[PDB]
Ligand binder design. Structure first.
Ligand code: MG
Length: 87
RNA sequence: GGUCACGCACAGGGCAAACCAUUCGAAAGAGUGGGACGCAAAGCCUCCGGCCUAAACCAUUGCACUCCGGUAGGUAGCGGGGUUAUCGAUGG
């Protein structure tokens, strides 16, 4: 189950990539070092984001702490990524 | 001479990238003026394949790391194709 990456669901689709990545970084940087934040705004990737943590514990902390956080109108749904493939 | 090609020329010459100023545009970018990287169609057309932007509208609750909805705008100086044009090596 636990992954270096957390997967954020239910994000506001009307926010630009630039500002969304910027915000997501402000939200999640306080839980630990982030390797990258993946945001695409393609049909398949809309309203979703991948935050990749240096450490699994700091990924687990973010998920536990920030479930359903009011974020640009919508409550963030967070799960672990199903796979990692950061390599 | 005309036509379909072709570009090693010759003649007239033509266009104008980046960057800047300014205007329109949510943006990509486009218009105009200055400016030349280059260009034998770098004249013009978005029918086809790409690439870029993606605000609004419609749709989508979606697990990616190759990129990808519709729609709309852009690129004709990314390519194809269409159509029009100067000269004529001896040039085919
Ligand atoms: Mg950081």
């Amino acid at each position: 189950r636990p992954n270096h990456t957390i997967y954020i669901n239910n994000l506001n689709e009307k926010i630009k990539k630039d500002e969304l990545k910027k915000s997501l970084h402000a939200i999640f940087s306080r839980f630990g070092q982030i390797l990258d934040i993946l945001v695409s705004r393609s049909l398949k990737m809309r309203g979703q984001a991948f935050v990749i943590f240096k450490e699994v514990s700091s990924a687990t902390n973010a998920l536990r702490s920030m479930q359903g956080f009011p974020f640009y109108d919508k409550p963030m749904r967070i799960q672990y990524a199903k796979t990692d493939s950061d390599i």
